[PDB]
Design an enzyme around this catalytic site. Structure first.
Site, PDB file in Angstrom:
ATOM      1  CG  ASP A  51      -1.907  -1.111   1.222  1.00  0.00           C
ATOM      2  OD1 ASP A  51      -2.600  -1.322   0.201  1.00  0.00           O
ATOM      3  OD2 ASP A  51      -1.992  -1.808   2.254  1.00  0.00           O
ATOM      4  CG  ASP A  66       1.146   2.441   7.617  1.00  0.00           C
ATOM      5  OD1 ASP A  66       1.271   2.291   8.852  1.00  0.00           O
ATOM      6  OD2 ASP A  66       0.232   3.132   7.105  1.00  0.00           O
ATOM      7  CG  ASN A 120       1.935   4.970   3.792  1.00  0.00           C
ATOM      8  OD1 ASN A 120       1.453   5.334   4.864  1.00  0.00           O
ATOM      9  ND2 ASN A 120       1.338   4.085   3.008  1.00  0.00           N
ATOM     10  CB  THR A 139      -5.639   3.505  -1.866  1.00  0.00           C
ATOM     11  OG1 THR A 139      -6.994   3.350  -2.299  1.00  0.00           O
ATOM     12  CG2 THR A 139      -5.601   3.906  -0.398  1.00  0.00           C
ATOM     13  CE  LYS A 189      -1.880   5.036   1.325  1.00  0.00           C
ATOM     14  NZ  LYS A 189      -3.269   5.545   1.405  1.00  0.00           N
TER      15      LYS A 189
HETATM   16  C1  LIG Z   1       4.870  -1.756  12.063  1.00  0.00           C
HETATM   17  C2  LIG Z   1       4.226  -0.380  11.927  1.00  0.00           C
HETATM   18  O1  LIG Z   1       4.018   0.165  13.243  1.00  0.00           O
HETATM   19  C3  LIG Z   1       3.855   1.518  13.241  1.00  0.00           C
HETATM   20  C4  LIG Z   1       4.093   2.243  14.408  1.00  0.00           C
HETATM   21  C5  LIG Z   1       3.929   3.627  14.421  1.00  0.00           C
HETATM   22  C6  LIG Z   1       3.524   4.283  13.266  1.00  0.00           C
HETATM   23  C7  LIG Z   1       3.363   5.664  13.288  1.00  0.00           C
HETATM   24  C8  LIG Z   1       2.969   6.349  12.136  1.00  0.00           C
HETATM   25  C9  LIG Z   1       2.782   7.736  12.110  1.00  0.00           C
HETATM   26  N1  LIG Z   1       1.653   8.369  11.774  1.00  0.00           N
HETATM   27  N2  LIG Z   1       1.816   9.592  11.841  1.00  0.00           N
HETATM   28  C10 LIG Z   1       0.764  10.594  11.541  1.00  0.00           C
HETATM   29  C11 LIG Z   1       1.073  11.462  10.287  1.00  0.00           C
HETATM   30  C12 LIG Z   1      -0.019  12.530  10.155  1.00  0.00           C
HETATM   31  C13 LIG Z   1       0.062  13.235   8.806  1.00  0.00           C
HETATM   32  N3  LIG Z   1      -0.206  12.226   7.771  1.00  0.00           N
HETATM   33  C14 LIG Z   1       0.917  11.272   7.702  1.00  0.00           C
HETATM   34  C15 LIG Z   1       1.127  10.548   9.049  1.00  0.00           C
HETATM   35  C16 LIG Z   1       3.045   9.918  12.219  1.00  0.00           C
HETATM   36  N4  LIG Z   1       3.653  11.113  12.426  1.00  0.00           N
HETATM   37  C17 LIG Z   1       4.923  11.196  12.820  1.00  0.00           C
HETATM   38  N5  LIG Z   1       5.607  10.052  12.993  1.00  0.00           N
HETATM   39  C18 LIG Z   1       5.065   8.817  12.807  1.00  0.00           C
HETATM   40  N6  LIG Z   1       5.818   7.748  13.021  1.00  0.00           N
HETATM   41  C19 LIG Z   1       3.729   8.722  12.403  1.00  0.00           C
HETATM   42  C20 LIG Z   1       2.727   5.618  10.969  1.00  0.00           C
HETATM   43  C21 LIG Z   1       2.880   4.235  10.939  1.00  0.00           C
HETATM   44  C22 LIG Z   1       3.282   3.562  12.092  1.00  0.00           C
HETATM   45  C23 LIG Z   1       3.450   2.181  12.088  1.00  0.00           C
END
Ligand SMILES: CCOc1ccc2cc(-c3nn(CC4CCNCC4)c4ncnc(N)c34)ccc2c1
Length: 457
Positions: free
Chosen positions: A133, A154, A138, A173, A135
């Protein structure tokens, strides 16, 4: 021996945002003060594809992996209703949001971006993990620094959790998904395709596979045909297009691997003057605004529905609690009832609830140490959330309206509602009810009105 409890270790600072499979909460270790970005996956909203044993093993592996372009994962927790994925926090925001903020962008910049992506992917592939997935949403930048590294997020979630079928969760997506994924038989090569799409967009500002709605996009992807006959492709090197061709090769066995892509002439040349791609930046800025507004539109409608639901539920909960029916509850009761309601990924703690109740109480100037009119509390607590949602949408409206005209045209609405996958004659109908002057355009308030009407209000 005891099972580890998430909230015993971490406190929620604030919401970082919404991602695939759950809410992401900024958290802090109660002892060490270490900050982490915790993705919270709701077991009720998301079904597992694999068993327990398979998941736990994947987590265990992911914790031990390390690469500068891959999100770092520290810990994993689980309880009755949730999984908690605890990772490194990144402050630089989404790649595309950074790119549109610049005055200049060349094939050199694009090549350095794509190398980072390909590098992270190559590594994960070596370890038999597939994103699927992948994009632009991510791809996060490590920090706000000009030369901040890209962190892919992700990786590995799709193998174990079923994707949401809700449009608010699916925005964007369809452009990036590999054809073989649609049909069921897929491998690590699907990630090369997605990167190829992203690259095509970086250098032209347009998706190679496009449409009026989700399914039309998917029809194009499935057919798999694309061209470089746009004007802005004239500015681009033949080698860039050659790599794109190789990444967007239909049959996955014939498609170039991630590792081999890193050795491609284009990568090797441009990552060691080059003109700016001014047209590409223009198109990406437009593309991003449109996507972000359709997203905002769906979230707004979703928030409105959630609020209608929760308003009546909270009132019913408190009514039952108000045993002698005089309308008077205290702070501890409001807390217990609010707790029963949440039974907000951000609210999965007792102290979180205590805090939130108090914020509501302070807003309305109700004395917190006596008894309170619960009907009045309910109004405020929900209005707060309603008001918050309105503000997020407006911001998105203003950003989309780059000309500061105050208006969105009918053509623009077609694009926006197309991306939001809202039926054409449906939104047109709601537009007709609101736009009785045949102006062929709407202001913010009129736009809001339409969205309210498209969620049964
Ligand atoms: C095995 C995978 O386990 C994990 C564990 C933690 C994870 C945290 C994040 C993460 N999300 N966001 C929010 C953003 C808001 C704006 N849009 C884009 C993203 C984030 N913002 C800042 N840092 C991050 N690390 C994230 C995404 C995937 C994760 C997967």
């Amino acid at each position: 021996h005891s099972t580890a409890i998430f909230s015993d270790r971490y406190k929620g600072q604030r919401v970082l945002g919404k991602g695939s499979f759950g809410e992401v909460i900024l958290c802090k270790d109660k002892i060490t003060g270490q900050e982490c970005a915790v993705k919270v996956i709701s077991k009720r909203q998301v079904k597992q594809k694999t068993d327990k044993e398979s998941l736990l093993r994947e987590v265990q592996l992911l914790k031990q992996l390390d690469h500068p372009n891959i999100m770092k994962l520290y810990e994993f927790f689980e309880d009755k209703g949730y999984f908690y994925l605890v990772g490194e926090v990144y402050t630089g925001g989404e790649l595309f949001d950074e790119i549109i903020s610049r005055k200049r962008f060349s094939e050199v910049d694009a090549a350095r971006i794509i190398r980072q992506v390909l590098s992270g992917i190559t590594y994960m592939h070596k370890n038999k993990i597939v994103h699927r997935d992948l994009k632009p949403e991510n791809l996060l930048l490590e920090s706000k620094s000009k030369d901040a590294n890209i962190r892919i997020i992700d990786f590995g979630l799709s193998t174990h959790f079923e994707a949401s079928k809700k449009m608010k969760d699916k925005i964007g997506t369809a452009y990036y998904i590999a054809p073989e994924v649609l049909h069921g038989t897929y491998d690590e090569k699907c990630d090369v395709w997605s990167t190829g799409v992203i690259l095509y967009i970086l250098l032209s500002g347009c998706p190679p596979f496009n449409g009026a709605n989700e399914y039309d996009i998917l029809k194009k992807v499935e057919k798999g045909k694309y061209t470089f006959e746009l004007p802005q492709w004239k500015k681009v090197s033949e080698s860039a297009k050659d790599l794109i061709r190789k990444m967007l090769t239909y049959v996955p066995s014939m498609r170039i691997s991630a590792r081999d892509a890193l050795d491609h002439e284009w990568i090797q040349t441009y990552t060691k003057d080059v003109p700016s791609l001014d047209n590409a930046i223009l198109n990406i800025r437009q593309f991003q605004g449109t996507q972000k507004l359709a997203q905002a539109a769906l979230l707004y409608m979703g928030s409105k529905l959630t609020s209608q639901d929760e308003t009546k539920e909270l009132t019913a909960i408190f009514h039952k609690m108000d045993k002698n029916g005089d309308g008077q509850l205290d702070r501890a009761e409001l807390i217990e009832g609010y707790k029963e309601l949440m039974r907000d990924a951000s609210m999965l703690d007792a102290s979180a609830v205590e805090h939130e109740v108090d914020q509501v109480l302070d807003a309305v100037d109700f004395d917190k140490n006596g008894y309170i009119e619960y009907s009045e509390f309910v109004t405020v607590a929900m209005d707060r959330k309603t008001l918050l949602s309105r503000e997020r949408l407006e911001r998105a409206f203003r950003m989309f309206d780059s000309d500061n005209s105050g208006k969105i045209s009918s053509t623009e609405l077609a694009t926006i509602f197309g991306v939001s996958d809202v039926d054409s004659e449906t939104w047109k109908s709601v537009l007709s009810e609101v736009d009785k002057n045949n102006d062929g355009e709407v202001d913010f308030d009129e736009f809001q009105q339409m969205l309210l009407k498209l969620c049964g209000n």
